[PDB]
Nucleic acid binder design. Structure first.
Lengths: 111, 82, 74, 306, 73, 75, 104, 77, 75, 98
RNA sequence: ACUCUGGUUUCUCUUCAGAUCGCAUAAAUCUUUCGCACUAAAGAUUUCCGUGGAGAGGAACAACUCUGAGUCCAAUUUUUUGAGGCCUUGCUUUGGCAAGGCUA
């Protein structure tokens, strides 16, 4: 076997990658539970920023510390399925629609 | 390698007593042992066939002439015998 | 597969050997092989008669060797 | 009293019918199984709890059986299989899968090697060494077999079925040796004594027979005929058992009455009420005179006969 | 070599080339018939019991072995 | 004093024994009252010329002074 | 049902290369020193403010023999991060502080 | 260090008066002049002679091939 | 982990089996020297008894090493 | 050994021009054999086959040893034997008496 | 080296989970503390977004990959020999046994 291949340096560089780029297997996450801005106000304030941006960093970090401190484990319960009980009712039907058409149907039904 | 040789290396440092084909019984602290039964021992009480007791301080026994060895009794809890 | 005997502790020491028919001999160990054949310098005979006879540099085949005895401190 | 346990105390917990009930030969535990696909292990004495449960049958359990060692439990099921379990911690150590139809019976070889002679609805009487994981010898009966058993020697198989005759097969001759004729319907239950000379027979002619399976041949093996029994429209596999002293026989009946005869007197000693359905298997405790009875009423009745 | 894996922990008698008797629990063996026997008793012929302990017997001086008693608990 | 129990120490559990020979490490219960930094355990009867071992010669000298008080002076 | 995933390593190399704009260049936790959740909880419990950190609402001492400033050598001014990094050396009444990580 | 096969080679270089002992035979010894060896220490002797312990009758042997499974000691004179 | 089959490391965290204090877990550094007594085999297969003292490597706890080197023979 | 090959057929060339070929004549010509073995016994019979260890199979043998009283030679008949090769002094083809 | 279990996917039902159950973070009620409470902290309770372990039922195709189980050494160092014969003493279970001295 040779000492190094083409995938050697990339394999070493992925060992020090952040989460989840250092992984190779996992579970999926629902799309609204993935913050894309969290590292940016979590690291530090850059130099030369105005006053209100620094205050915005400090208030977002305040909300993050409050959500971290007020966290408690959720209570055990029966698994919850509203649409599975809606599906067994004969008054509801299932279909496949475009997003824009059902988005118009929901707002006109609300009107 | 077999099981009794690992037991023989396990009994190094302890006082064993060996009898060889010439009927002589050598009791003392086992210093070194090999794959074959070449046993280097020290501080040896020597019993001959007639009954003379001698004190020989360094003995090296060839494994070919050995009838058997007698090992300490606390080796029944040794890991290779369990 | 035949490993050499660990005889480095007994090199250049005065040892007495026992041989097959109740035989006894003495001398200085000078080396070995992995078949435990021994070279002995200053070899005195010392049979069961009790009289001592020096020979010199001799070779003992290992098959008749019963025991070594280190007269000198190792 | 003449035992250690309570009087008539009931065993509830079976979810459907109980087709077979067997005592552990040490006499302190108990196995009962049936339509639940689920064997229940009870305690014979004490408060009669259910200490262990055996799942691993995809169909109803036709025949439970214990070797005289008592550690492993043999279970011929309805689906196609015979399971081998252990009794202490209770996991199925083996499946035996060679029958092509509903397996109606199994039997332990108790003296020599652990052989399980089984019979099924295809007609094949298959023998099962557990270390082979295969069928050793298949004795091809042309009709259904409802009960199979070894002798004391474990060198012959005694298969009773719907062919109106009890048929014994030699393990070395590999043929049918003789045909015990004299029944007029399907033979549902065969059981053999601890001393191994005599063999019980239940059939839907509403009669019980005692045969003598032994090399000494009296040329007409139907020595004792017992009446009182009935077989009904339900057409179950009405089983049998011997007393450990060999003095009493018990054949399960279809009229909810636990039947126990005397072997010598040939009279019904015990006709016990309490069950509500057809009584499939009625068993005997090894040490003390205690009787359990399994029936379609989803219940078992332990009870001091003497 | 499963015939000696069947003999494990059995109380067994051992006959030497010298005619002496080693009765011990069969703990371990090898291909050169070197025996590890625990709690060994030596019988010789005048009969006497000589307690040994843990015996490592060389195969060159063993002739034949036989089984005496079941293993203890 | 009187030895209560003797252990040999593993990290997250302790194995209780009833005797410890020479050359080993030992965990002793019931002698903690006169011990300040180090101690020497001898026999009560005999061993009349027993002297103590040396105290620990540390690698450095502590120089940082801090003063403490309780908040409630009654405590 | 699209619940579990596993990938190959050049694919993970490519997805890490394309996402380089959203990810920081950090390699260790020698960053975030006195700027992590335990130091923020300590600043919460001690009612102080880290420089750059958040502010919080709070969760009158006489002259004694103990707080004599004639006994105190004032050489360098003591700040709040000294109280936060070492919560039990410089603090009076340290009730609900949390011990931060030391060093990686 | 000297290994014994090189000393046997030096003996056949020096054609010395080699006296060979025997396994299990304390009485009967053989004087000889060594010529060659092998891997299993089989030894030829040029002018060999047999000497007992109680009898001591020196009989002529000639060039013998004494086996490896019999010898004990290779001593001079 | 070599001496115990049932003790294994987590996939994401260090074990720290000989870090039993809460300060040693929260700070992430060693504070107190902790002993352990194990049996280990060598290359040739002989069992040996080891008394291993884990001393903290921080400089201010150098006094924890001097108390560890009083009762040992090798470093 | 300088011949580590798998197709090892020197042991039958050992049985043809080597020393052990003495027995193969008694395999082929089926001659009478006399065996002097270690506890002073004389075995006369017919060997079937053997190997490089001289582990022999013999049939229809008469074996003799003397007893001391003063030494008188006794004999006994054995139909068939297996003889281990290390337990012999010598193996002998009996000469042509004619 | 020859055979017997165990499949994967999807849908539904029933139980347990203070495990970062969720590598993300909501809303309501009550008490207390101050302002004068969205610009505010703590405690308790509850509601919703939806998840991991176990069991049961259904039906779309692959059936022995994997997980298991049942199924070349004769020449020192051990297994291809230093082996067998003689004498004396104690007991002779009159076969010989134990010890010692021998020849090979």
């Amino acid at each position: 076997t040779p000492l190094y291949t083409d995938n050697t340096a990339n394999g070493i560089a992925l060992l020090w990658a952040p989460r989840p780029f250092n992984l190779r297997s996992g579970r999926t996450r629902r799309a609204l539970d993935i913050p894309l801005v969290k590292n940016w106000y979590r690291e530090h304030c850059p130099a030369g920023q105005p006053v209100k941006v620094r205050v915005s960093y400090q208030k977002l970090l305040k909300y993050y510390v409050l959500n971290a401190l007020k966290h408690r484990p959720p209570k055990a319960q029966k698994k919850r399925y509203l649409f599975r009980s809606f599906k067994a009712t004969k008054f509801f039907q299932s279909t496949k629609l475009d997003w824009v058409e059902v988005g118009l149907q929901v707002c006109r039904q609300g009107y | 390698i077999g099981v009794p040789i690992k037991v023989l290396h396990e009994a190094e440092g302890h006082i064993v007593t060996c009898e060889t084909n010439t009927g002589e019984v050598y009791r003392g602290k086992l210093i070194e042992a090999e794959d074959n039964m070449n046993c280097q021992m020290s501080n040896i009480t020597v019993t001959y066939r007639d009954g003379r007791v001698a004190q020989l301080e360094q003995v090296y026994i060839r494994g070919s002439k050995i009838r058997f060895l007698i090992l300490p009794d606390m080796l029944k809890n040794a890991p290779m015998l369990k | 597969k035949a490993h050499p005997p660990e005889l480095k502790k007994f090199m250049d020491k005065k040892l007495s050997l026992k041989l097959n028919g109740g035989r006894h001999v003495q001398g200085i160990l000078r080396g070995f092989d992995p078949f435990m054949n021994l070279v002995i310098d200053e070899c005195v005979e010392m049979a069961t008669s009790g009289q001592q006879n020096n020979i010199g540099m001799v070779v003992i085949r290992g098959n008749s060797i019963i025991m070594l005895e280190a007269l000198e401190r190792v | 009293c003449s035992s250690l346990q309570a009087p008539i105390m009931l065993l509830s917990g079976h979810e459907g019918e109980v087709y077979c009930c067997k005592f552990h030969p040490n006499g302190s535990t108990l196995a009962s199984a049936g339509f639940d696909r689920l064997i229940l292990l009870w305690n014979v004495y004490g408060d009669c709890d259910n200490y262990a449960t055996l799942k691993g049958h995809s169909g109803a359990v036709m025949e439970l059986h214990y070797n005289t060692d008592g550690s492993m439990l043999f279970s011929a099921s309805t689906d196609k299989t015979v399971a081998v379990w252990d009794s202490e911690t209770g996991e199925r150590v083996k499946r035996l899968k060679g029958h092509t139809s509903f397996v109606n019976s199994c039997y332990p070889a108790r003296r020599g090697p652990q052989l399980v002679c089984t019979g099924s609805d295809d007609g094949t009487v298959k023998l099962w060494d557990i270390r082979k994981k295969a069928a050793i010898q298949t004795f091809q009966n042309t009709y259904q077999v409802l009960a199979v058993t070894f002798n004391d020697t474990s060198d012959q198989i005694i298969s009773g079925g719907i062919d109106n005759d009890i048929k014994v097969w030699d393990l070395r001759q590999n043929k049918l040796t003789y045909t015990m004729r004299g029944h007029a319907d399907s033979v549902t239950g065969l059981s053999l004594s601890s001393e191994g000379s005599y063999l019980l027979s239940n059939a839907m002619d509403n009669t019980v027979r005692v045969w003598d399976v032994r090399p000494f041949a009296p040329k007409e093996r139907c020595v004792k005929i017992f009446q009182g029994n009935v077989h009904n429209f339900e057409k179950n596999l009405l089983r049998c058992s011997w007393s450990p002293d060999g003095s009493k026989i018990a054949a399960g009946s279809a009229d909810r009455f636990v039947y126990v005869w005397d072997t010598t007197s040939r009279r019904i000693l015990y006709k016990l009420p309490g069950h509500a359905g057809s009584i499939n298997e009625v068993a005997f405790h090894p040490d003390e005179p205690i009787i359990i009875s399994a029936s379609s009423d989803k219940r078992l009745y332990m009870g001091e006969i003497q | 070599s499963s015939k000696m894996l069947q003999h494990i922990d059995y109380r067994m008698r051992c006959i030497l080339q010298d005619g002496r008797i080693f009765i011990g629990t069969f703990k371990a063996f090898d291909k050169h018939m070197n025996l590890i026997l625990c709690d060994c008793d030596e019988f010789r012929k005048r009969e006497e019991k000589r307690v040994l302990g843990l015996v490592l017997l060389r195969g060159e001086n063993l002739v034949s072995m036989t089984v005496e008693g079941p293993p203890p608990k | 004093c009187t030895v209560g129990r003797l252990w040999i120490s593993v990290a997250r559990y302790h194995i209780e024994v009833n005797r410890v020979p020479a050359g080993n490490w030992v965990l002793i219960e019931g002698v903690d009252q006169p011990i300040v930094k180090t101690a020497t355990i001898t026999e009560p009867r005999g061993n009349e010329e027993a002297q103590i071992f040396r105290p620990l010669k540390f690698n450095t000298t502590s120089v940082i002074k801090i003063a403490v008080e309780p908040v409630n002076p009654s405590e | 049902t699209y619940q579990r995933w596993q990938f190959t390593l050049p694919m993970m190399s490519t997805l890490y290369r394309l996402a380089n704009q959203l990810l920081t260049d950090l390699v260790d936790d020698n960053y975030f020193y006195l700027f992590d959740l335990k130091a923020f909880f300590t600043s919460k419990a001690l009612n102080m403010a880290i420089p750059g950190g958040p502010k919080f609402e709070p969760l009158d001492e006489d002259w004694n023999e103990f707080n004599d400033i004639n006994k105190i050598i004032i050489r360098q001014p003591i700040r709040t991060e000294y109280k936060i990094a070492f919560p039990y050396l410089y603090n009076n009444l340290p009730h609900h502080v949390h011990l931060t990580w030391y060093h990686t | 260090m000297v290994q014994p096969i090189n000393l046997i080679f030096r003996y056949l270089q020096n054609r010395s008066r080699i006296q060979v002992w025997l396994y299990e035979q304390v009485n009967m010894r053989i004087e000889g002049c060594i010529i060659g060896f092998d891997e299993y220490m089989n030894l030829v002797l040029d002018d060999a002679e047999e000497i007992h312990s109680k009898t001591k009758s020196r009989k002529q042997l000639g060039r013998i091939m004494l086996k490896g499974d019999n010898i004990t000691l290779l001593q001079s004179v | 982990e070599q001496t115990h089959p049932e003790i294994r490391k987590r996939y994401d965290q260090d074990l720290c089996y000989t870090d039993i204090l809460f300060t040693e877990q929260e700070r992430g550094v060693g504070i107190k020297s902790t002993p352990v007594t194990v049996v280990l085999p060598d290359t040739k297969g002989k069992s040996y008894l080891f008394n291993i003292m884990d001393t903290p490597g921080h400089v201010n706890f150098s006094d924890e090493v001097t108390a560890g080197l009083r009762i040992s023979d090798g470093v | 050994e300088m011949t580590p090959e798998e197709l090892q057929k020197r042991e039958e060339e050992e049985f043809n021009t080597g020393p052990l070929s003495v027995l193969t004549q008694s395999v082929k010509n089926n001659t009478q054999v006399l065996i002097n073995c270690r506890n002073n016994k004389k075995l006369l019979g017919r060997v079937k086959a053997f190997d490089r260890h001289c582990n022999m199979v013999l049939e229809n043998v008469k074996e003799m040893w003397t007893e001391v009283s003063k030494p008188v030679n006794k004999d006994r008949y054995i139909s068939k034997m297996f003889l281990r090769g290390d337990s012999v002094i010598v193996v002998l083809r009996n000469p042509l008496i004619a």
